[PDB]
Design an enzyme around this catalytic site. Structure first.
Site, PDB file in Angstrom:
ATOM      1  CG  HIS A  85       9.094   1.609   4.489  1.00 58.10           C
ATOM      2  ND1 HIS A  85       8.052   1.118   3.726  1.00 58.10           N
ATOM      3  CD2 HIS A  85       8.739   1.379   5.777  1.00 58.10           C
ATOM      4  CE1 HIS A  85       7.130   0.629   4.548  1.00 58.10           C
ATOM      5  NE2 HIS A  85       7.531   0.767   5.806  1.00 58.10           N
ATOM      6  CG  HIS A  87       8.762   0.293   9.152  1.00 57.85           C
ATOM      7  ND1 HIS A  87       7.650   1.065   8.891  1.00 57.85           N
ATOM      8  CD2 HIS A  87       9.500   0.977  10.046  1.00 57.85           C
ATOM      9  CE1 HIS A  87       7.724   2.162   9.623  1.00 57.85           C
ATOM     10  NE2 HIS A  87       8.831   2.147  10.328  1.00 57.85           N
ATOM     11  CG  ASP A  89       5.987  -3.794   6.592  1.00 57.46           C
ATOM     12  OD1 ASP A  89       6.766  -3.075   7.275  1.00 57.46           O
ATOM     13  OD2 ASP A  89       4.960  -3.334   6.034  1.00 57.46           O
ATOM     14  CG  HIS A 150       4.350   4.086   6.153  1.00 56.27           C
ATOM     15  ND1 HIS A 150       3.517   3.648   7.154  1.00 56.27           N
ATOM     16  CD2 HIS A 150       5.435   3.288   6.200  1.00 56.27           C
ATOM     17  CE1 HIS A 150       4.082   2.623   7.781  1.00 56.27           C
ATOM     18  NE2 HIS A 150       5.253   2.371   7.223  1.00 56.27           N
ATOM     19  CG  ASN A 181       2.846   1.123  13.078  1.00 55.67           C
ATOM     20  OD1 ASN A 181       3.241   2.239  13.498  1.00 55.67           O
ATOM     21  ND2 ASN A 181       3.196  -0.042  13.670  1.00 55.67           N
TER      22      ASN A 181
HETATM   23  C1  YSX Z   1       6.087  -3.450  10.631  1.00 55.26           C
HETATM   24  C2  YSX Z   1       5.395  -2.144  10.751  1.00 55.26           C
HETATM   25  C3  YSX Z   1       3.969  -2.499  11.156  1.00 55.26           C
HETATM   26  C4  YSX Z   1       3.597  -3.245  12.308  1.00 55.26           C
HETATM   27  C5  YSX Z   1       2.247  -3.480  12.575  1.00 55.26           C
HETATM   28  C6  YSX Z   1       1.211  -2.999  11.752  1.00 55.26           C
HETATM   29  C7  YSX Z   1       1.564  -2.252  10.627  1.00 55.26           C
HETATM   30  C8  YSX Z   1       0.821  -1.572   9.644  1.00 55.26           C
HETATM   31  C9  YSX Z   1      -0.663  -1.525   9.501  1.00 55.26           C
HETATM   32  C10 YSX Z   1      -1.541  -1.363  10.571  1.00 55.26           C
HETATM   33  C11 YSX Z   1      -2.902  -1.236  10.337  1.00 55.26           C
HETATM   34  C12 YSX Z   1      -3.417  -1.304   9.046  1.00 55.26           C
HETATM   35  C13 YSX Z   1      -4.915  -1.186   8.831  1.00 55.26           C
HETATM   36  S1  YSX Z   1      -5.459   0.561   8.698  1.00 55.26           S
HETATM   37  C14 YSX Z   1      -4.666   1.051   7.217  1.00 55.26           C
HETATM   38  O1  YSX Z   1      -6.875   0.649   8.432  1.00 55.26           O
HETATM   39  O2  YSX Z   1      -4.995   1.271   9.910  1.00 55.26           O
HETATM   40  C15 YSX Z   1      -2.528  -1.485   8.002  1.00 55.26           C
HETATM   41  F1  YSX Z   1      -2.947  -1.566   6.710  1.00 55.26           F
HETATM   42  C16 YSX Z   1      -1.179  -1.582   8.203  1.00 55.26           C
HETATM   43  C17 YSX Z   1       1.751  -0.970   8.797  1.00 55.26           C
HETATM   44  C18 YSX Z   1       1.607  -0.006   7.708  1.00 55.26           C
HETATM   45  O3  YSX Z   1       0.768   0.923   7.932  1.00 55.26           O
HETATM   46  O4  YSX Z   1       2.492   0.072   6.798  1.00 55.26           O
HETATM   47  N1  YSX Z   1       2.995  -1.240   9.214  1.00 55.26           N
HETATM   48  C19 YSX Z   1       2.916  -2.007  10.345  1.00 55.26           C
HETATM   49  N2  YSX Z   1       5.874  -1.165  11.690  1.00 55.26           N
HETATM   50  C20 YSX Z   1       5.637   0.213  11.448  1.00 55.26           C
HETATM   51  O5  YSX Z   1       5.079   0.660  10.425  1.00 55.26           O
HETATM   52  C21 YSX Z   1       6.213   0.996  12.572  1.00 55.26           C
HETATM   53  N3  YSX Z   1       6.744  -0.016  13.484  1.00 55.26           N
HETATM   54  C22 YSX Z   1       7.349   0.247  14.791  1.00 55.26           C
HETATM   55  C23 YSX Z   1       8.877   0.185  14.680  1.00 55.26           C
HETATM   56  C24 YSX Z   1       9.508   1.584  14.738  1.00 55.26           C
HETATM   57  N4  YSX Z   1      10.636   1.761  13.847  1.00 55.26           N
HETATM   58  C25 YSX Z   1       6.490  -1.316  12.962  1.00 55.26           C
HETATM   59  O6  YSX Z   1       6.723  -2.352  13.479  1.00 55.26           O
HETATM   60 ZN    ZN Z   2       3.731  -1.296   6.145  1.00 56.25          ZN
HETATM   61 ZN    ZN Z   3       6.298   0.721   7.457  1.00 55.05          ZN
END
Ligand code: YSX
Ligand code: ZN
Ligand code: ZN
Length: 232
Positions: A85, A87, A89, A150, A181
Protein backbone atom coordinates in the site's frame (compact mmCIF):
# COMPACT_ATOMS: atom_id res chain seq x y z
CA UNK A 1 19.15 -15.24 19.20
CA UNK A 2 16.22 -16.85 17.38
CA UNK A 3 13.08 -15.18 18.80
CA UNK A 4 11.07 -12.81 16.56
CA UNK A 5 12.65 -9.47 17.07
CA UNK A 6 10.53 -6.79 18.87
CA UNK A 7 10.31 -2.93 18.71
CA UNK A 8 12.60 -2.33 21.70
CA UNK A 9 15.22 -4.79 20.39
CA UNK A 10 15.87 -3.01 17.06
CA UNK A 11 17.50 0.45 17.00
CA UNK A 12 16.11 2.74 14.35
CA UNK A 13 18.37 2.30 11.31
CA UNK A 14 19.17 -1.43 11.79
CA UNK A 15 17.39 -4.30 10.05
CA UNK A 16 16.95 -7.90 11.11
CA UNK A 17 15.83 -10.87 9.07
CA UNK A 18 13.81 -13.83 10.38
CA UNK A 19 13.52 -17.13 8.60
CA UNK A 20 9.84 -18.02 8.17
CA UNK A 21 10.09 -21.11 5.95
CA UNK A 22 12.34 -22.48 3.26
CA UNK A 23 13.05 -19.56 0.95
CA UNK A 24 10.88 -17.14 2.95
CA UNK A 25 12.10 -14.47 5.39
CA UNK A 26 10.55 -11.49 7.04
CA UNK A 27 12.43 -8.27 7.48
CA UNK A 28 11.99 -6.12 10.57
CA UNK A 29 12.99 -2.51 11.07
CA UNK A 30 12.00 0.37 13.34
CA UNK A 31 11.11 3.96 12.64
CA UNK A 32 9.97 7.09 14.45
CA UNK A 33 6.69 8.76 13.54
CA UNK A 34 5.06 11.64 15.45
CA UNK A 35 7.48 11.10 18.33
CA UNK A 36 6.94 7.38 18.91
CA UNK A 37 8.88 4.38 17.66
CA UNK A 38 7.29 1.48 15.84
CA UNK A 39 8.42 -1.81 14.31
CA UNK A 40 7.37 -2.87 10.86
CA UNK A 41 7.63 -6.03 8.77
CA UNK A 42 8.21 -6.91 5.17
CA UNK A 43 8.86 -10.14 3.26
CA UNK A 44 11.67 -11.68 1.17
CA UNK A 45 10.90 -14.66 -1.08
CA UNK A 46 13.50 -16.67 -2.99
CA UNK A 47 12.79 -16.57 -6.77
CA UNK A 48 15.32 -19.14 -8.15
CA UNK A 49 18.72 -17.42 -7.86
CA UNK A 50 17.11 -13.99 -7.25
CA UNK A 51 14.94 -12.50 -4.51
CA UNK A 52 11.51 -10.85 -4.53
CA UNK A 53 11.11 -8.14 -1.87
CA UNK A 54 7.70 -7.23 -0.39
CA UNK A 55 7.67 -3.72 1.12
CA UNK A 56 10.46 -1.37 2.08
CA UNK A 57 11.96 -1.10 5.56
CA UNK A 58 10.23 2.24 6.30
CA UNK A 59 12.69 4.87 5.06
CA UNK A 60 15.66 5.37 2.83
CA UNK A 61 18.36 4.61 5.41
CA UNK A 62 16.49 1.60 6.76
CA UNK A 63 16.03 0.28 3.22
CA UNK A 64 19.75 0.67 2.45
CA UNK A 65 20.43 -1.29 5.64
CA UNK A 66 17.93 -3.94 4.51
CA UNK A 67 19.81 -4.46 1.25
CA UNK A 68 23.09 -4.80 3.17
CA UNK A 69 21.53 -7.30 5.57
CA UNK A 70 20.17 -9.35 2.68
CA UNK A 71 23.62 -9.45 1.11
CA UNK A 72 25.16 -10.59 4.37
CA UNK A 73 22.60 -13.22 5.31
CA UNK A 74 21.29 -14.52 1.96
CA UNK A 75 23.68 -13.31 -0.75
CA UNK A 76 21.23 -13.37 -3.68
CA UNK A 77 20.28 -10.23 -5.59
CA UNK A 78 16.98 -8.46 -5.00
CA UNK A 79 15.59 -7.95 -8.48
CA UNK A 80 11.97 -6.89 -7.93
CA UNK A 81 9.95 -5.31 -5.14
CA UNK A 82 6.22 -4.97 -4.54
CA UNK A 83 4.76 -2.39 -2.17
CA UNK A 84 1.48 -3.50 -0.62
CA UNK A 85 0.00 0.00 0.00
CA UNK A 86 0.98 3.65 -0.30
CA UNK A 87 2.18 4.51 3.23
CA UNK A 88 5.81 5.27 4.11
CA UNK A 89 6.32 1.93 5.88
CA UNK A 90 5.67 0.29 2.45
CA UNK A 91 7.12 2.72 -0.14
CA UNK A 92 9.63 4.80 1.84
CA UNK A 93 12.88 3.45 0.43
CA UNK A 94 11.62 2.84 -3.12
CA UNK A 95 14.07 5.44 -4.44
CA UNK A 96 16.94 3.53 -2.72
CA UNK A 97 15.70 0.31 -4.29
CA UNK A 98 15.43 1.85 -7.72
CA UNK A 99 19.05 3.10 -7.48
CA UNK A 100 20.23 -0.36 -6.41
CA UNK A 101 18.82 -2.01 -9.62
CA UNK A 102 15.55 -3.20 -8.14
CA UNK A 103 12.45 -2.96 -10.30
CA UNK A 104 9.64 -1.53 -8.08
CA UNK A 105 5.99 -2.36 -8.50
CA UNK A 106 2.60 -1.47 -6.93
CA UNK A 107 -1.02 -1.35 -8.00
CA UNK A 108 -2.14 1.77 -9.91
CA UNK A 109 -4.21 2.71 -6.85
CA UNK A 110 -1.14 2.59 -4.60
CA UNK A 111 0.88 4.60 -7.11
CA UNK A 112 -1.75 7.34 -7.32
CA UNK A 113 -2.15 7.53 -3.52
CA UNK A 114 1.61 7.58 -3.01
CA UNK A 115 1.98 10.41 -5.52
CA UNK A 116 -0.79 12.44 -3.92
CA UNK A 117 0.65 11.91 -0.41
CA UNK A 118 4.15 12.99 -1.38
CA UNK A 119 5.52 9.48 -0.77
CA UNK A 120 8.00 7.63 -3.01
CA UNK A 121 6.38 6.07 -6.03
CA UNK A 122 7.04 2.54 -7.38
CA UNK A 123 7.87 2.51 -11.08
CA UNK A 124 5.61 -0.21 -12.47
CA UNK A 125 1.85 -0.68 -12.22
CA UNK A 126 0.31 -4.03 -11.28
CA UNK A 127 -2.87 -4.48 -13.31
CA UNK A 128 -5.43 -7.15 -12.60
CA UNK A 129 -5.94 -6.20 -8.91
CA UNK A 130 -8.62 -3.51 -9.07
CA UNK A 131 -11.63 -5.50 -7.83
CA UNK A 132 -11.88 -7.21 -4.47
CA UNK A 133 -11.12 -10.93 -4.76
CA UNK A 134 -8.67 -10.37 -7.66
CA UNK A 135 -5.45 -12.31 -7.66
CA UNK A 136 -2.39 -12.33 -9.90
CA UNK A 137 0.85 -14.27 -9.88
CA UNK A 138 4.17 -12.48 -9.39
CA UNK A 139 7.23 -14.72 -9.30
CA UNK A 140 6.95 -17.09 -6.36
CA UNK A 141 3.92 -15.34 -4.82
CA UNK A 142 0.26 -14.63 -5.43
CA UNK A 143 -0.90 -11.06 -4.92
CA UNK A 144 -4.49 -10.67 -3.71
CA UNK A 145 -6.66 -7.58 -3.31
CA UNK A 146 -9.12 -8.28 -0.45
CA UNK A 147 -10.96 -4.97 -0.55
CA UNK A 148 -10.55 -1.88 1.55
CA UNK A 149 -9.25 -2.44 5.06
CA UNK A 150 -6.30 -0.61 6.61
CA UNK A 151 -6.26 1.36 3.34
CA UNK A 152 -8.32 1.22 0.14
CA UNK A 153 -5.34 -0.10 -1.80
CA UNK A 154 -3.92 -2.75 0.56
CA UNK A 155 -2.72 -5.98 -1.00
CA UNK A 156 -1.99 -9.28 0.64
CA UNK A 157 0.69 -11.77 -0.51
CA UNK A 158 0.60 -15.58 -0.39
CA UNK A 159 3.62 -17.85 -0.80
CA UNK A 160 2.08 -21.11 -2.05
CA UNK A 161 5.24 -23.24 -1.63
CA UNK A 162 5.17 -22.57 2.11
CA UNK A 163 1.55 -21.66 2.85
CA UNK A 164 2.74 -18.28 4.16
CA UNK A 165 0.18 -15.48 4.22
CA UNK A 166 1.67 -12.00 4.45
CA UNK A 167 -1.25 -9.83 5.44
CA UNK A 168 0.53 -6.52 5.49
CA UNK A 169 -1.19 -3.78 7.41
CA UNK A 170 -4.67 -5.28 6.81
CA UNK A 171 -3.69 -7.85 9.49
CA UNK A 172 -2.67 -7.13 13.06
CA UNK A 173 -0.71 -9.15 15.54
CA UNK A 174 -2.44 -11.06 18.35
CA UNK A 175 -1.30 -8.61 21.06
CA UNK A 176 -2.88 -5.61 19.32
CA UNK A 177 -5.45 -3.54 21.26
CA UNK A 178 -6.77 -1.31 18.52
CA UNK A 179 -6.58 -1.23 14.82
CA UNK A 180 -3.25 0.70 14.62
CA UNK A 181 -3.10 3.76 12.37
CA UNK A 182 -6.58 4.04 10.90
CA UNK A 183 -6.16 7.42 9.22
CA UNK A 184 -6.81 5.96 5.77
CA UNK A 185 -8.83 2.91 6.82
CA UNK A 186 -12.38 1.71 6.00
CA UNK A 187 -13.38 0.27 9.42
CA UNK A 188 -16.83 -0.78 8.16
CA UNK A 189 -15.45 -2.72 5.14
CA UNK A 190 -12.40 -4.15 6.88
CA UNK A 191 -14.13 -7.22 8.42
CA UNK A 192 -15.59 -8.12 5.00
CA UNK A 193 -12.13 -7.83 3.50
CA UNK A 194 -10.65 -10.03 6.21
CA UNK A 195 -13.40 -12.58 5.60
CA UNK A 196 -12.38 -12.64 1.93
CA UNK A 197 -8.79 -13.36 2.98
CA UNK A 198 -9.93 -16.19 5.27
CA UNK A 199 -12.00 -17.72 2.50
CA UNK A 200 -9.28 -17.44 -0.13
CA UNK A 201 -6.37 -18.77 1.98
CA UNK A 202 -7.80 -21.40 4.35
CA UNK A 203 -4.59 -23.47 4.33
CA UNK A 204 -2.32 -20.69 5.48
CA UNK A 205 0.12 -21.98 8.12
CA UNK A 206 1.88 -18.74 9.04
CA UNK A 207 0.26 -15.33 9.01
CA UNK A 208 2.51 -12.25 9.09
CA UNK A 209 1.06 -8.85 10.09
CA UNK A 210 2.35 -5.51 8.79
CA UNK A 211 3.64 -4.73 12.28
CA UNK A 212 4.46 -7.19 15.08
CA UNK A 213 4.70 -10.91 15.59
CA UNK A 214 3.69 -13.62 13.10
CA UNK A 215 1.30 -16.36 14.16
CA UNK A 216 -1.30 -18.57 12.63
CA UNK A 217 -4.73 -18.07 11.12
CA UNK A 218 -6.08 -16.61 14.40
CA UNK A 219 -4.48 -13.28 13.47
CA UNK A 220 -7.27 -12.85 10.92
CA UNK A 221 -10.16 -13.25 13.34
CA UNK A 222 -8.32 -11.21 15.97
CA UNK A 223 -7.93 -8.43 13.42
CA UNK A 224 -11.66 -8.47 12.65
CA UNK A 225 -12.35 -8.35 16.40
CA UNK A 226 -10.14 -5.35 17.12
CA UNK A 227 -11.37 -3.43 14.11
CA UNK A 228 -15.06 -3.96 14.98
CA UNK A 229 -14.42 -2.69 18.48
CA UNK A 230 -12.45 0.31 17.19
CA UNK A 231 -15.30 1.26 14.81
CA UNK A 232 -17.67 0.97 17.79
C1 YSX B 1 3.29 4.95 8.32
C2 YSX B 1 1.90 4.73 8.78
C3 YSX B 1 2.02 4.58 10.29
C4 YSX B 1 2.58 5.55 11.18
C5 YSX B 1 2.61 5.30 12.55
C6 YSX B 1 2.09 4.12 13.12
C7 YSX B 1 1.53 3.17 12.27
C8 YSX B 1 0.88 1.94 12.48
C9 YSX B 1 0.66 1.24 13.78
C10 YSX B 1 0.26 1.89 14.95
C11 YSX B 1 -0.01 1.15 16.09
C12 YSX B 1 0.14 -0.23 16.10
C13 YSX B 1 -0.14 -1.01 17.38
S1 YSX B 1 -1.92 -1.44 17.54
C14 YSX B 1 -2.13 -2.53 16.19
O1 YSX B 1 -2.16 -2.22 18.73
O2 YSX B 1 -2.70 -0.18 17.44
C15 YSX B 1 0.55 -0.85 14.93
F1 YSX B 1 0.72 -2.20 14.86
C16 YSX B 1 0.80 -0.15 13.79
C17 YSX B 1 0.50 1.47 11.22
C18 YSX B 1 -0.34 0.36 10.80
O3 YSX B 1 -1.39 0.19 11.50
O4 YSX B 1 -0.20 -0.15 9.64
N1 YSX B 1 0.88 2.35 10.27
C19 YSX B 1 1.50 3.40 10.88
N2 YSX B 1 0.89 5.72 8.53
C20 YSX B 1 -0.47 5.33 8.43
O5 YSX B 1 -0.86 4.14 8.50
C21 YSX B 1 -1.29 6.54 8.19
N3 YSX B 1 -0.33 7.64 8.20
C22 YSX B 1 -0.66 9.06 8.08
C23 YSX B 1 -0.39 9.54 6.65
C24 YSX B 1 -1.70 9.75 5.87
N4 YSX B 1 -1.63 9.35 4.48
C25 YSX B 1 0.97 7.14 8.45
O6 YSX B 1 1.97 7.76 8.60
ZN1 ZN C 1 1.38 -0.21 8.49
ZN1 ZN D 1 -0.43 1.86 6.29
Amino acid sequence: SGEYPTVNEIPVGEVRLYQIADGVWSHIATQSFDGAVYPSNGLIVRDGDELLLIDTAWGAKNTAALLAEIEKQIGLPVTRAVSTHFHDDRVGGVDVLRAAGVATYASPSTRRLAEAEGNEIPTHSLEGLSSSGDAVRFGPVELFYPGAAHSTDNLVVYVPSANVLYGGCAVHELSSTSAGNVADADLAEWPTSVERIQKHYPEAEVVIPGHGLPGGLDLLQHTANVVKAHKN
